[PDB]
Amino acid sequence: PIITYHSVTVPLARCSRTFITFSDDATFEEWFPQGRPPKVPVREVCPVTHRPALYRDPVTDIPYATARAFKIIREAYKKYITAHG
Amino acid sequence: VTRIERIGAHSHIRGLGLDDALEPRQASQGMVGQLAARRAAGVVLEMIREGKIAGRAVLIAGQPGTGKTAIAMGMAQALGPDTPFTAIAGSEIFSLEMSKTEALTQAFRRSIGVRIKEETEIIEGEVVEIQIDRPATGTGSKVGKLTLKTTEMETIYDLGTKMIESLTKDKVQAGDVITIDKATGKISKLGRSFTRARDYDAMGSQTKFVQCPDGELQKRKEVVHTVSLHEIDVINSRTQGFLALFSGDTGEIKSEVREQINAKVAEWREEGKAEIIPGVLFIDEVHMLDIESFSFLNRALESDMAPVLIMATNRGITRIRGTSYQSPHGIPIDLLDRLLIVSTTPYSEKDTKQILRIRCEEEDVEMSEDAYTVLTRIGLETSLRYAIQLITAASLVCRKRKGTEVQVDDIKRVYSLFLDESRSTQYMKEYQDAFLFN
Amino acid sequence: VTRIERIGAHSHIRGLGLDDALEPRQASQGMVGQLAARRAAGVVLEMIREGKIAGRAVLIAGQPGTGKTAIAMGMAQALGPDTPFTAIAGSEIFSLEMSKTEALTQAFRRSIGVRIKEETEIIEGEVVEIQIDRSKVGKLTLKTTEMETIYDLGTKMIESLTKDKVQAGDVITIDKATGKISKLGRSFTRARDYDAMGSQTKFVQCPDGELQKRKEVVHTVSLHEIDVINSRTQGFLALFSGDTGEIKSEVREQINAKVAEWREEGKAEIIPGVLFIDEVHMLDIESFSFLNRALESDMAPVLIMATNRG
Amino acid sequence: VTRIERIGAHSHIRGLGLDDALEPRQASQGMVGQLAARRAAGVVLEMIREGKIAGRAVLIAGQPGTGKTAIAMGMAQALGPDTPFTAIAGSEIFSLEMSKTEALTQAFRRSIGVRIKEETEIIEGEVVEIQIDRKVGKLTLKTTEMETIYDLGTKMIESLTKDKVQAGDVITIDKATGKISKLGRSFFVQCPDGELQKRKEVVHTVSLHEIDVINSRTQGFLALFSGDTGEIKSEVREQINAKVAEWREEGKAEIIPGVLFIDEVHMLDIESFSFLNRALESDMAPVLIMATNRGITRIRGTSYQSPHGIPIDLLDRLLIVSTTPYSEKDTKQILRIRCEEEDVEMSEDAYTVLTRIGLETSLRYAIQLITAASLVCRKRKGTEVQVDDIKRVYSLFLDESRSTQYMKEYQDAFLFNE
Amino acid sequence: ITPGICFSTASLVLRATDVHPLQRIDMGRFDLIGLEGRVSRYEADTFLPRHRLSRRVLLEVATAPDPPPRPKPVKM
Amino acid sequence: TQRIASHSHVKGLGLDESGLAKQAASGLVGQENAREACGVIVELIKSKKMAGRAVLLAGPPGTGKTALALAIAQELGSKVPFCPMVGSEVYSTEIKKTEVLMENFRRAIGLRIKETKEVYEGEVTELTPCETENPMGGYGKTISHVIIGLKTAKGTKQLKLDPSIFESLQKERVEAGDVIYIEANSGAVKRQGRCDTYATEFDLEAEEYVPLPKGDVHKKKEIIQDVTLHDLDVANARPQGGQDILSMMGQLMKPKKTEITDKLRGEINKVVNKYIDQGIAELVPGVLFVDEVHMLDIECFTYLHRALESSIAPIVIFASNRGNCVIRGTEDITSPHGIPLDLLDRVMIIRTMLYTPQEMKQIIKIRAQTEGINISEEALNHLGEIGTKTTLRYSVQLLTPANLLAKINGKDSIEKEHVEEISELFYDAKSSAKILADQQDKYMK
Amino acid sequence: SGAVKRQGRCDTYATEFDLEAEEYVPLPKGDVHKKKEIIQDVTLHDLDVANARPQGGQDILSMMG
Amino acid sequence: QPVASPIGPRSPGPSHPTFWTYTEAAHRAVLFPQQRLDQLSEIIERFIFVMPPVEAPPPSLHACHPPPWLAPRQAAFQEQLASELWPRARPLHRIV
Numbered sequence A: 001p002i003i004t005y006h007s008v009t010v011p012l013a014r015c016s017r018t019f020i021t022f023s024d025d026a027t028f029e030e031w032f033p034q035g036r037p038p039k040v041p042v043r044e045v046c047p048v049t050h051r052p053a054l055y056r057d058p059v060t061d062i063p064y065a066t067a068r069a070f071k072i073i074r075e076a077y078k079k080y081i082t083a084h085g
Numbered sequence B: 001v002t003r004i005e006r007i008g009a010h011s012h013i014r015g016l017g018l019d020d021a022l023e024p025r026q027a028s029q030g031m032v033g034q035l036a037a038r039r040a041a042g043v044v045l046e047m048i049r050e051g052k053i054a055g056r057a058v059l060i061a062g063q064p065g066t067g068k069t070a071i072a073m074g075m076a077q078a079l080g081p082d083t084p085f086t087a088i089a090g091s092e093i094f095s096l097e098m099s100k101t102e103a104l105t106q107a108f109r110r111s112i113g114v115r116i117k118e119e120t121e122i123i124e125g126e127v128v129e130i131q132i133d134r135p136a137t138g139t140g141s142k143v144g145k146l147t148l149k150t151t152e153m154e155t156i157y158d159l160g161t162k163m164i165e166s167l168t169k170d171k172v173q174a175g176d177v178i179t180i181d182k183a184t185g186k187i188s189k190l191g192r193s194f195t196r197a198r199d200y201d202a203m204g205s206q207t208k209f210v211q212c213p214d215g216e217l218q219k220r221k222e223v224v225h226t227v228s229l230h231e232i233d234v235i236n237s238r239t240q241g242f243l244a245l246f247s248g249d250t251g252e253i254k255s256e257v258r259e260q261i262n263a264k265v266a267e268w269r270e271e272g273k274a275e276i277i278p279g280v281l282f283i284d285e286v287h288m289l290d291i292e293s294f295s296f297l298n299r300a301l302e303s304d305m306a307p308v309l310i311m312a313t314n315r316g317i318t319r320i321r322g323t324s325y326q327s328p329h330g331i332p333i334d335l336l337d338r339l340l341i342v343s344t345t346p347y348s349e350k351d352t353k354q355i356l357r358i359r360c361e362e363e364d365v366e367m368s369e370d371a372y373t374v375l376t377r378i379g380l381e382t383s384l385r386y387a388i389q390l391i392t393a394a395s396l397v398c399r400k401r402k403g404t405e406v407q408v409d410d411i412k413r414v415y416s417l418f419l420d421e422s423r424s425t426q427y428m429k430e431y432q433d434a435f436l437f438n
Numbered sequence C: 001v002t003r004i005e006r007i008g009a010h011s012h013i014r015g016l017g018l019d020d021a022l023e024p025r026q027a028s029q030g031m032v033g034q035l036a037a038r039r040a041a042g043v044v045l046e047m048i049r050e051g052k053i054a055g056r057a058v059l060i061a062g063q064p065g066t067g068k069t070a071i072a073m074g075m076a077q078a079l080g081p082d083t084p085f086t087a088i089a090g091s092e093i094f095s096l097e098m099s100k101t102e103a104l105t106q107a108f109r110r111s112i113g114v115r116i117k118e119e120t121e122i123i124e125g126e127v128v129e130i131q132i133d134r135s136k137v138g139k140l141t142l143k144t145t146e147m148e149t150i151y152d153l154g155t156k157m158i159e160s161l162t163k164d165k166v167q168a169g170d171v172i173t174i175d176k177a178t179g180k181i182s183k184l185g186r187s188f189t190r191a192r193d194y195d196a197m198g199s200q201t202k203f204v205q206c207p208d209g210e211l212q213k214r215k216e217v218v219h220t221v222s223l224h225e226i227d228v229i230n231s232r233t234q235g236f237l238a239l240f241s242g243d244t245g246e247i248k249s250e251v252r253e254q255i256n257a258k259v260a261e262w263r264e265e266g267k268a269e270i271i272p273g274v275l276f277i278d279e280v281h282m283l284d285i286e287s288f289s290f291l292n293r294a295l296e297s298d299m300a301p302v303l304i305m306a307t308n309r310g
Numbered sequence D: 001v002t003r004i005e006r007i008g009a010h011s012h013i014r015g016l017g018l019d020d021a022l023e024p025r026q027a028s029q030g031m032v033g034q035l036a037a038r039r040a041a042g043v044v045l046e047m048i049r050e051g052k053i054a055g056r057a058v059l060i061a062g063q064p065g066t067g068k069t070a071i072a073m074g075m076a077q078a079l080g081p082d083t084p085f086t087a088i089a090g091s092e093i094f095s096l097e098m099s100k101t102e103a104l105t106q107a108f109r110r111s112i113g114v115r116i117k118e119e120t121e122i123i124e125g126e127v128v129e130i131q132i133d134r135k136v137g138k139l140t141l142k143t144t145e146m147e148t149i150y151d152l153g154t155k156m157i158e159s160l161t162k163d164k165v166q167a168g169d170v171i172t173i174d175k176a177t178g179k180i181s182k183l184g185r186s187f188f189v190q191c192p193d194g195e196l197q198k199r200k201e202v203v204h205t206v207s208l209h210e211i212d213v214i215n216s217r218t219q220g221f222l223a224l225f226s227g228d229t230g231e232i233k234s235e236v237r238e239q240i241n242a243k244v245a246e247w248r249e250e251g252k253a254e255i256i257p258g259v260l261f262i263d264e265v266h267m268l269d270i271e272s273f274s275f276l277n278r279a280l281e282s283d284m285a286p287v288l289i290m291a292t293n294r295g296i297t298r299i300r301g302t303s304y305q306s307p308h309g310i311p312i313d314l315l316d317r318l319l320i321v322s323t324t325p326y327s328e329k330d331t332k333q334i335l336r337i338r339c340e341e342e343d344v345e346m347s348e349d350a351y352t353v354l355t356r357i358g359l360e361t362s363l364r365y366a367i368q369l370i371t372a373a374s375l376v377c378r379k380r381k382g383t384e385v386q387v388d389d390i391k392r393v394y395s396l397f398l399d400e401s402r403s404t405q406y407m408k409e410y411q412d413a414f415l416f417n418e
Numbered sequence E: 001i002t003p004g005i006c007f008s009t010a011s012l013v014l015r016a017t018d019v020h021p022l023q024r025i026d027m028g029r030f031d032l033i034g035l036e037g038r039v040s041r042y043e044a045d046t047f048l049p050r051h052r053l054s055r056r057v058l059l060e061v062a063t064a065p066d067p068p069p070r071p072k073p074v075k076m
Numbered sequence F: 001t002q003r004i005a006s007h008s009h010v011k012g013l014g015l016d017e018s019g020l021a022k023q024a025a026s027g028l029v030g031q032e033n034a035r036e037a038c039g040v041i042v043e044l045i046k047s048k049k050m051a052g053r054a055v056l057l058a059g060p061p062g063t064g065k066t067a068l069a070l071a072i073a074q075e076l077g078s079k080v081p082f083c084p085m086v087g088s089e090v091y092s093t094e095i096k097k098t099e100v101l102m103e104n105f106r107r108a109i110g111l112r113i114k115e116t117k118e119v120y121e122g123e124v125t126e127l128t129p130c131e132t133e134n135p136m137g138g139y140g141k142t143i144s145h146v147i148i149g150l151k152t153a154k155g156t157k158q159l160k161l162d163p164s165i166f167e168s169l170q171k172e173r174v175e176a177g178d179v180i181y182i183e184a185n186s187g188a189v190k191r192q193g194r195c196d197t198y199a200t201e202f203d204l205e206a207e208e209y210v211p212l213p214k215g216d217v218h219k220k221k222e223i224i225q226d227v228t229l230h231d232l233d234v235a236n237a238r239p240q241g242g243q244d245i246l247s248m249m250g251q252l253m254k255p256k257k258t259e260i261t262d263k264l265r266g267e268i269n270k271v272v273n274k275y276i277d278q279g280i281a282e283l284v285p286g287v288l289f290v291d292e293v294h295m296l297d298i299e300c301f302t303y304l305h306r307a308l309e310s311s312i313a314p315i316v317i318f319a320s321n322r323g324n325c326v327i328r329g330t331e332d333i334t335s336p337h338g339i340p341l342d343l344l345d346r347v348m349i350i351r352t353m354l355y356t357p358q359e360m361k362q363i364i365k366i367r368a369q370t371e372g373i374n375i376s377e378e379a380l381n382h383l384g385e386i387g388t389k390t391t392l393r394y395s396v397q398l399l400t401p402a403n404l405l406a407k408i409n410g411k412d413s414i415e416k417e418h419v420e421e422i423s424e425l426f427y428d429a430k431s432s433a434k435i436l437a438d439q440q441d442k443y444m445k
Numbered sequence G: 001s002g003a004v005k006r007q008g009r010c011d012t013y014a015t016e017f018d019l020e021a022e023e024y025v026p027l028p029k030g031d032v033h034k035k036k037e038i039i040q041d042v043t044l045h046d047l048d049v050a051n052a053r054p055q056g057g058q059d060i061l062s063m064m065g
Numbered sequence H: 001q002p003v004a005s006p007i008g009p010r011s012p013g014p015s016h017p018t019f020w021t022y023t024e025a026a027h028r029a030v031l032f033p034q035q036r037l038d039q040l041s042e043i044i045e046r047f048i049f050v051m052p053p054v055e056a057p058p059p060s061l062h063a064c065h066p067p068p069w070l071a072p073r074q075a076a077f078q079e080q081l082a083s084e085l086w087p088r089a090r091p092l093h094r095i096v
């Protein structure tokens, strides 16, 4: 499996052109994955204060933007643990 | 557009202006008059060109403004760039990094050139097609093929790994006129024979093309490398010597290194590998050297690697620096016995006018005959340099009033505006108490 | 107890003893007599405090024992510690490392203070967990007494965390703009009862409040300090050793321009001060010639001098 | 074969030539005459060897060519190599690497030695077999009387790998350090005879300067060979002095005060003299010996006249030993000793003529003429130097007086005459 | 090529500057140049004056039992 | 800039279009002949065709020599280099005096470099090879172009580039959504981070996320860079930025000025000439002002002859207020300005005269205007009378203490009483000298 | 400070090999934990020179320094 | 870091003002030591010949019972310095 770099002289009175040849399709895919454009992440919002989210409590995975919001989320998680068990 | 080199004090001096018999012409190559001194300078120049006698010293002595430095610059211009010419001032040998003897040694050895001439095989051609095959992943042996073309030849070369790496580093493409040295493998691109493909973007404006080389592909060319003894000493003193060639900071080079280098250069000369190109060291205002420097010069001129030494001084019987001894030219008699002295006579009226005419021609200034007469009278009364400066000053004054030719009125105006030493001293005497000390 | 500052030759001087009209009192703030000299010193002090005029020179001349150094110390005391007051003797400019003109330039630039003001956003918390999958991508959990969140790390952040050997229980701050990580301390747990501690470890309380914080730093530095910082790669070391050498004039011009830019941007303020040279008669003629044109710059402090020579 | 130490100016001096009562002999150990100076030097030597009084200074003063340096060299020879004897010239303290006071401090501290005795185990033998396996290894060594196999550790295995050791080499190993030095091969040095492992007592005399330089910085011992000491801080020197006092109190070391000799002391300036004035007042100061031929002369660095170019404050701390000019008999005996040193045979008439020449001009001039006359005699295939050879070399080589006369004859031809 | 100079000295000389830890004070309490490039103004001025430990807090943490295990993350 | 220095009022030479000097213009009063000569010198500097010309400003102290030099500098402008220097500066502990002088000479010769930098900015939206329907060699796939889509704030463009750029793209690890810039003059791809639109508030990277570039995808501008020959000399003598052991040593070791060799300077001259011929650069010869030239020693003066005789030297302006003084470095050699007659033969001397009382009053009024000080007519006349005795510098230095005293007294203008009180408080040189002479026994030495 | 100095091997292991380049030291006599209250005099110059140059440092510039 | 030089610092991109301040012409007029070595390759190959007459290793300090920590510390210091600096000394190989 090789990559062939080729430069030729071809009439246009002459112009220079360069070509790159891949022996196998695996190398071509590896060098050119043709990746689709990435997606813009959704701007998460704090369920407690509705302000734009700035943090992410690891235990509950609930984004929040206020210390009071964190306390409320942790109280809700404690109540959920007490109820469900 | 103005180059880095502009009209200076000696910009009009293109040579000594001598004929085949070393007879000075009255006005040629910028030099006017000083016939005896120019003839002596020509004899010294022939001695330098012959390059057979080491450690010859010449002293150009005369009154201020008599053309000592003009003669030195004429000798330098007549020698040409092939022969080394180190021009330094006497004050330059006083250095905080090295001793005075070390500075003098470096000045001497900057005036001797070592030339190495060798023949190498050279490939120069237009790249037609280059192909490089490399493994997709991991270490492997690159295989390649290169086609080169001249007006009368075209050969396809099988490329090795290191030549492949060199071509890849140089980014050699089709249409590039490249030079390959077979021994070292160095590749130098010297142009493009035609443009690249137009459909490519972000390529920039294409420059002019270069005609394809003619003749055979693999030629044999003579390569000449010329360095001075000082450069060899510096690059051999220490590993960082190549950087010391530019930053200075050479310190004091061991005498062992210089002795070894002298021996090796002698061996090369005997074996025909290298030729020694003796030059000139010109110390302007040599009276600033002290007694120790003169004593070092005394015995340093006795070496076979010493160049021709040319000194200029305008001193009479003056105290030698570092001593309390009065000597001619400020130079000890022991050194004065080792050197030939070239005297410069003062200039007459016609010589002064001719020098002024040459200066005006150099500065592209048009002046009237009456203005030339007045300027010559001022130069005879005051000095030559004052008249030379008034040339440009009057040119500027004339250009200010939308004129074309420098008249007597402009010369009078610049004479009023700018003062010489004599009138300044008179005006300082008139207000002596106002000035600070004495 | 006995502190390092003890009764000296001018310990009794606390000021120039002037009223609001710069009229000297007969005995106030530890100064007696010298009414005309004290009034002149007060005028010079008002000139210094205004800061409008640059490169003004005053010479305190008189017989030995007449209060010249007393007046200089009174001026220094009356002037706040905010305004620089570089007091040197004439003999101190003769250095084996730098020229006399360089010594005088450094003395001049030590007398101009630059008060900087930088506001920077930081993240501050105690590290709970660091998980790195494989040095490619990872997560960092930070906590306060009132907060806790998890962060996604990149390649450079992971490399910086591994270089600093940040582990659990460490209280660190991270600069948002530059990403540099400095470790403040580590939290104390029952399992961290070390018998021997390293020279840099120290135990601190877990930070309170919010994980994102703003850091405001205000400090006064001189032009000479900025010159020494920017002279070489670790030039701040020369601010301790003094092996500054002769700083290039281009560096000084660049630093003057940069300081002017900061002053325009509001990130710095200039506080011109006083350079006091005691026993100036020890200066050489070269030093006086340099002083002639050094005072003519727009970044020249007030030069107060004192000699007792006839 | 020609070794480095050839015949010098004081090669014949082997001591002071004194009896048990410090009474000098007329001719002994290369010394002739100057009984009073030699007796004073012997008293000073007894003072040096006693080692109780510190910083005592003696000045040998006298006319040029009166045995001052001869007395100093005889004092150095009478002391063994055990006692330090630092000999410098006055010009040597002027350095671009350090200050004059630093140079004199290093000269002083070079003259005080610290003698430390320690015991080490040294293994010296011939290698029989060396085995290293992937770490463990075995080594078999033999002498002419015993053979042994050793089980090697990791550090000794590494040391033996670093220094290529193969069978047949004769090596010595310092057990505690692994210092292996190959001293030849045997099958060229003979194999060691006795026990393979020997406990040896090694004694080192280390100067205070050496301790300071070794402890000044990491790899600081290199400065003992390349200068580069800079100016050692006073804190390091005080700490070293304190530690040496602790060693002396604890019995770990003994102090061996020595002698610092400054030939041509008059080259020192006023600053160096003032420094010596107080440097001699320390308890670690050595015995200072100085030589000068100056009369009432300007002290360098000042405009003052003083008896020897030494200020009187220093002179008040010195004991001065005066050397007297030599007689005809003493001159002849010195010439005989120098001839014996140079292996030159002269006739008695030649000796008489040479003694007259030495009295008329200088003793050193006659000593110089001895070798020239020997060479002239060897040129004409002779074996004994005659009066004709001495006259020939007298005509060939001039003295100061005749040179000055000839120069005054042509004073205009010379350069810069006052 | 010459062998190097082997300079032999007393083993006691290499320990001349060495001082036992029980005989010397900690010089790190005067280390100002060591703080440069490592310690920030925030730590010295704002953080440490507020979040210095106290003897009471240290004793409380040491005497108190081990904290409860951290709950596992739950996707909620 | 905001602080007022001693020459803050000098805005140039007050010359008419015909070269005649106005009595009071551009902050300068009197000195008409010196101003006319300085205007001729300014024209000489602007002509750019002369090298090594020297001008000496000679006159009693406090006559505007430094003011005239600064007026010349103002006339030339910031484009023309102006290197001020005092004579005491040649005495350095690192390099020799001649080296300091040569370095200042190279500092005075400036070079202006003009280049066009063409770049392509954008966020990579598309990365698609352009395959060929006929693969070379029969097997595999061959590519003839790589289409890169670049997106900015106000546009989106596609660039068909050389196939060789695939290696740069892989080396830079450029993917979709990354912000890159491609330089036309080099054909290289540089990844300046990833777009900020793909960053979340929970990310912790610092230099990874960058804003989407503003403006057009294709940005080209003309870059004008002003450098001096000394800048290039220093950058080549002690280079910074290498990764070899020598660069590490240079960073570690204390920086030190070195004696740059003539070889490096000749190489720099060759490069400058090549740039000038190519049209890249334009030479800007400026002025070297050496104030207090009398502080130079005989070695410096001797070197100045060769320095000025060179064809690369700038136009040097000297200034000396000395009379028949003894040259430094020589034993009892007296010259008219402290300068040897050999160097005086190489200079044009401009004489500055003393000021009449009216001119002193005008200069005081100008200085008061510059310092923001309102002064009454009677106070101005009294201060000018004070300036008739003593000196002009004393009078111009009494303005700000008097303004402060008036402000403390509660007045917005300086009255005569304030000037009298300030004169009582502060002594001039002559009064102090009289005091010292009257009490020479009580003073020291 | 946490400084560790390895002052040799214990003499109980001196016979583990017949020839090693090791320095064998007796077992310490007192307790493992040793406390001493000391009074040491330093001068201001000692602190000045202690803060003039950095000490230690694993960086390349520090090592070359 | 490159304060007051024709060479500009590493500008992040065209968004930074430093990108449009410095020129490539000024950069090409300044040569790094590696560029100087590449420029003087033929001179180095042909003209560097001086060898010291004698070559010796540095003096070694030997004690019977040295502090057992000095040698490992020196070895570690040398190892770290060599590992950090030897790759940077490869360009000087031909000169050596």
Ligand SMILES: Nc1ncnc2c1ncn2[C@@H]1O[C@H](COP(=O)(O)OP(=O)(O)O)[C@@H](O)[C@H]1O
Pocket (backbone or CB within 6 Å): B008, B009, B010, B011, B013, B030, B031, B032, B033, B034, B063, B064, B065, B066, B067, B068, B069, B070, B071, B314, B355, B384, B385
């Ligand atoms: N014979 C001559 N021919 C042409 N020009 C001359 C001659 N003599 C002097 N000059 C010019 O006069 C100027 C001053 O002469 P210079 O050589 O500097 O005098 P000095 O010998 O005192 O150095 C120089 O620019 C020089 O070119």
Ligand SMILES: Nc1ncnc2c1ncn2[C@@H]1O[C@H](COP(=O)(O)OP(=O)(O)O)[C@@H](O)[C@H]1O
Pocket (backbone or CB within 6 Å): C009, C010, C030, C031, C032, C033, C034, C063, C064, C065, C066, C067, C068, C069, C070, C071, C308
């Ligand atoms: N006006 C004053 N009030 C109080 N103390 C003074 C006064 N003038 C001088 N002294 C004291 O006299 C001593 C010497 O005066 P000082 O000003 O320090 O030196 P000098 O005046 O000789 O330059 C100082 O200790 C200072 O405290």
Ligand SMILES: Nc1ncnc2c1ncn2[C@@H]1O[C@H](COP(=O)(O)OP(=O)(O)O)[C@@H](O)[C@H]1O
Pocket (backbone or CB within 6 Å): D009, D010, D011, D013, D030, D031, D032, D033, D034, D063, D064, D065, D066, D067, D068, D069, D070, D071, D291, D334, D363, D364
């Ligand atoms: N008493 C003596 N016995 C033997 N040799 C002597 C005696 N005195 C001088 N010499 C020798 O004669 C020479 C004279 O030198 P010396 O007297 O030492 O000169 P200085 O007077 O400078 O010390 C020396 O080579 C010395 O060896």
Ligand SMILES: Nc1ncnc2c1ncn2[C@@H]1O[C@H](COP(=O)(O)OP(=O)(O)O)[C@@H](O)[C@H]1O
Pocket (backbone or CB within 6 Å): F006, F007, F008, F010, F027, F028, F029, F030, F031, F060, F061, F062, F063, F064, F065, F066, F067, F068, F321, F363, F392, F393
């Ligand atoms: N003709 C003038 N017009 C306006 N201001 C002047 C004039 N001459 C001098 N000054 C000012 O007076 C002060 C005197 O300094 P200056 O005369 O430049 O000193 P020097 O005479 O040493 O050059 C300077 O601050 C200058 O600005």
Ligand SMILES: [Mg+2]
Pocket (backbone or CB within 6 Å): B068, B069, B070, B284, B312, F305
């Ligand atoms: Mg000349």
Ligand SMILES: [Mg+2]
Pocket (backbone or CB within 6 Å): C068, C069, C070, C306
């Ligand atoms: Mg005082």
Ligand SMILES: [Mg+2]
Pocket (backbone or CB within 6 Å): D068, D069, D263, D291
């Ligand atoms: Mg002697």
